[PDB]
Amino acid sequence: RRAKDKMVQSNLRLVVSIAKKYMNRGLSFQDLIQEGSLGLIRAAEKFDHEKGYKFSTYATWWIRQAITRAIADQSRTIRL
DNA sequence: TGAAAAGGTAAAGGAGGTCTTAAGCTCGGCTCAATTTCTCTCTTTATCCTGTTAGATGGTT
């Protein structure tokens, strides 16, 4: 539990760094951060050390996907 | 006992309702093309879900 907690916790800075690139699309900056946190959690749940890659490369995909999906599902009143 | 005075009866005539036809119409049925619903298949999208491996790591107005 503590290991997963630390993996997510120490990468929130990465989450903020990616989430700052969509601050004018329908979601507030704080919403982008909290939606990308879910992607970071999933990335930390599916990271493979045996792949031999940096976590900052795998986590970016999940963070970006979570934020993009959140924008697609929460930016408009009449959701498309 | 005679005499009003009212009350009847039998007509003629009219008034009114009820019957009859020649002229004409229009109305429904019958057929019969000519089509709009319906109900299956048979697809075909509309909507949702999951994943993505170079590295990246604190805001703008």
UniProtKB/Swiss-Prot annotation:
Residues 7-77 are annotated as: Sigma-70 factor domain-2. It comes from the Bacteria. It is found in: Cytoplasm. A motif (Interaction with polymerase core subunit RpoC) lies at residues 31-34. Interacts transiently with the RNA polymerase catalytic core. Belongs to the sigma-70 factor family. RpoD/SigA subfamily. Sigma factors are initiation factors that promote the attachment of RNA polymerase to specific initiation sites and are then released. This sigma factor is the primary sigma factor during exponential growth. This is RNA polymerase sigma factor SigA1. It comes from Synechococcus elongatus (strain ATCC 33912 / PCC 7942 / FACHB-805). The chain holds residues 161 to 240 of 399 of the full protein.
